[PDB]
């Protein structure tokens, strides 16, 4: 009795089929790598964002908070990074256009949007590759499977007498190919959905923060402007 | 050994099937060219938008920048086009109806929307075709494959002694159709998602620009209008 | 060689088979017809809405515009209907509650939303049929194939000597069923996505205009309110 090894099937595979199987293997592997790295980065970012949101909403002073962040600014992310940049813009616009709390606030918010979009990009990296791979791979596998099948019927028609025995290898190989494609595909797609969901969650939280900081900045700018006059 | 190679089978392909194959090959080539041209357009547009963003954010005088844009007004593109449209509209309406700053602001926003959507037509152009290809192509391949395969397969059952030879070459060829279809679909779909992504990025950039410029124009209108009344 | 045209297999097909085939054929015909008529509708709507907005933004008198539109109220479409509804409700509301420009504005906004949604439904007719068609037809190709293989097995099991000839009609039936299913589906998917996109574009246009007219009318109501107290 001989162990039923897929290797005998591999070395009989045509040029194209083997190459495609390799494509699928690589895509699957990178799927796993991206899934892991991005997942860890996203989870940690979410947790730090939660902590910073609670710290800000802790009633902590805005200027105190900004000094504290500015101390370690070289490592800001997400909510805190946007806070730092937006506080900077609020400071500078108030210094230049204290006479226009609303206009100052608007430039503040725009600096915030700038930083936020930067972070959204920094975090999304490689995900569209996930969606692309998941959405594309099944077609790849079907393509290879069809190719093997074609070569099988090439083996079959070129023989006057028919038989099942001459064709089984091609069928086995091609079906393996379809299977491999599906194996690679499913993880990619699942991860794509999940990650985009969590990303949207983060995005909503950040936009909420931007508007909340914006309105708090409105109150801060108006109050600083008026109390220094009366 | 019969030189039963794929090229020749295609050469001697049946009527309707060969017609389908040519259709799909054209789809493939057109996908190729659309990808190439649009890629060039989008890269150059990303570059030009980049530079225009950088020069605008520089604090450079609005009138000076408008004059420099005007110098080549005949060949404006992207944020440059939006800026020219809005700014010229603003100046004209300000000089005609300075008394209604809100109204002039609204007109300017109208103008920037108009030019921007025009630009998005210029850029997005032909992509929905790429989508259409990545959507239909598999089914066209199926259809041609099925038609020809039916012909051969039922050609078999009209003889007393079912023999493999009367079919295997025919089906081997017919499968070529679906192969080609998927081969066209793959790069099609990859490019589709890629290009749509880049387009969304452009869209966000332009919208943020539109808003910032809108704020600036509101500010200029109000400041000048109130200053002239002092 | 038998002139083995598909018509022969269809005519020799069993009753339920022919019913299924004709069901698919009708779906396909209606699908193309819907796509055609709806596309013409949407093109006309796009052109007319575009022109209407262009002329309206031109600064022409709002009241004169409403007079002219009332000149053919029997034949308002899209933007024109929305303008007429909003302006008429504005007239009535201001005659009632000019004191509350916010209340009058919100009432006119409700009116315009109603008119818009009515128009949108008027446009979207039968699109969901296309969605359903693209959703179902391949399932039909399946079940047809299944019944075909069923009769194939019935025939194969009733002969003393097994022969692949008896199942040939069943699988031929399967093939024809699936081919028709694919043929009906292709246009479905293609046009369905196309049309949803276009209608959403128009919806954006109308929403944008609605907001614009909303602000304009709020301003106009306030202006008339202030003038009445002069």
């Amino acid at each position: 009795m001989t162990d039923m090894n897929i290797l005998d099937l591999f070395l009989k595979a045509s040029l194209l089929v083997k190459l495609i199987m390799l494509i699928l293997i690589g895509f699957s592997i990178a799927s796993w790598a991206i899934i892991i790295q991005r997942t860890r980065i996203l989870n940690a970012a979410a947790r730090e964002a939660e902590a910073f949101e609670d710290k800000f909403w802790s009633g902590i002073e805005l200027s105190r908070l900004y000094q504290e962040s500015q101390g370690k600014r070289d490592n800001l992310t997400g909510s805190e990074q946007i806070f730092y940049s937006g506080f900077k813009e609020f400071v500078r616009l108030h210094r230049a256009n204290s006479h226009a709390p609303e206009a100052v606030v608007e430039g503040a918010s725009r600096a915030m949007r700038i930083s936020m979009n930067r972070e959204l990009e920094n975090l999304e990296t490689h995900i569209p590759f996930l969606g692309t791979v998941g959405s594309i791979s099944p077609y790849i596998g079907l393509f290879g499977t069809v190719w093997g099948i074609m070569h099988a019927f090439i083996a079959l028609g070129a023989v006057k007498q028919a038989t099942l025995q001459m064709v089984a290898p091609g069928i086995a190989e091609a079906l393996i190919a379809t299977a491999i494609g599906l194996f690679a595909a499913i993880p990619a797609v699942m991860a794509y959905n999940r990650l985009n969901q969590r990303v949207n969650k983060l995005e909503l939280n950040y936009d909420n923060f931007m508007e909340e900081f914006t309105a708090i900045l409105h109150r801060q700018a108006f109050t600083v402007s008026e109390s220094n006059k009366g | 050994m019969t030189d039963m190679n794929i090229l020749d089978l295609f050469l001697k392909a049946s009527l309707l099937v060969k017609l389908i194959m040519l259709i799909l090959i054209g789809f493939s080539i057109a996908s190729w060219a659309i990808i190439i041209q649009r890629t060039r357009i989008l890269n150059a547009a990303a570059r030009e938008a980049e530079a225009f963003e950088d020069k605008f954010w520089s604090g450079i005088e609005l009138s000076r920048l408008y004059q420099e844009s005007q110098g080549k007004r005949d060949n404006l593109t992207g944020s440059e086009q939006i800026f020219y449209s809005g700014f010229k509209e603003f100046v004209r309406l300000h000089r005609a109806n300075s008394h209604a700053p809100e109204a002039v602001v609204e007109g300017a926003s109208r103008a920037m929307r108009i030019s921007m959507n025009r630009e998005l037509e210029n850029l997005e152009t032909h992509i929905p075709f790429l989508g259409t290809v990545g959507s239909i192509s598999p089914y066209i391949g199926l259809f041609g494959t099925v038609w020809g395969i039916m012909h051969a397969f039922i050609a078999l059952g009209a003889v007393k002694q079912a023999t493999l030879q009367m079919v295997a070459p025919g089906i081997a060829e017919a499968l070529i159709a679906t192969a080609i279809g998927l081969f066209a679909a793959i790069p099609a779909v990859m490019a589709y998602n890629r290009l749509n992504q880049r387009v969304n990025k452009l869209e966000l950039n332009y919208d943020n620009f539109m808003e910032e410029f809108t704020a600036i124009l509101h500010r200029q209108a109000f400041t000048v209008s109130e200053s002239n009344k002092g | 060689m038998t002139d083995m045209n598909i018509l022969d297999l269809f005519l020799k097909a069993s009753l339920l088979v022919k019913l299924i085939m004709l069901i698919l054929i009708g779906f396909s015909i209606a699908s193309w017809a819907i796509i055609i008529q709806r596309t013409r509708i949407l093109n006309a709507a796009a052109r007319e809405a575009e022109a209407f907005e262009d002329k309206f933004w031109s600064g022409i008198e709002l009241s004169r515009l409403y007079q002219e539109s009332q000149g053919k109220r029997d034949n308002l479409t899209g933007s024109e209907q929305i303008f007429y509804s909003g302006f008429k409700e504005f007239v009535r509301l201001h005659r009632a509650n000019s004191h509350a420009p916010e209340a009058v504005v919100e009432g006119a906004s409700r009116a315009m939303r109603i008119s818009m949604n009515r128009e949108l439904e008027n446009l979207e007719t039968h699109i969901p049929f296309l969605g359903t068609v693209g959703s179902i037809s391949p399932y039909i190709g399946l079940f047809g194939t299944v019944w075909g293989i069923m009769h194939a097995f019935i025939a194969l099991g009733a002969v003393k000597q097994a022969t692949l000839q008896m199942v040939a009609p069943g699988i031929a039936e399967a093939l024809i069923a699936t081919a028709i299913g694919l043929f009906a589906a292709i246009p479905a998917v293609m046009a369905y996505n196309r049309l949803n996109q276009r209608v959403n574009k128009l919806e954006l246009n109308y929403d944008n205009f609605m907001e614009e007219f909303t602000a304009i009318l709020h301003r106009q109501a306030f202006t008339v309110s202030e003038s009445n107290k002069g």
Partner: peptide, 21 residues
């Protein structure tokens, strides 16, 4: 994941597979 085009083939495969006898 579009699946429609997938196996509508394979059935086809096994028809020639049958033609092998």
């Amino acid at each position: 994941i579009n699946i429609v085009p997938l196996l509508d083939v394979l059935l086809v495969l096994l028809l020639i597979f049958m033609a092998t006898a």
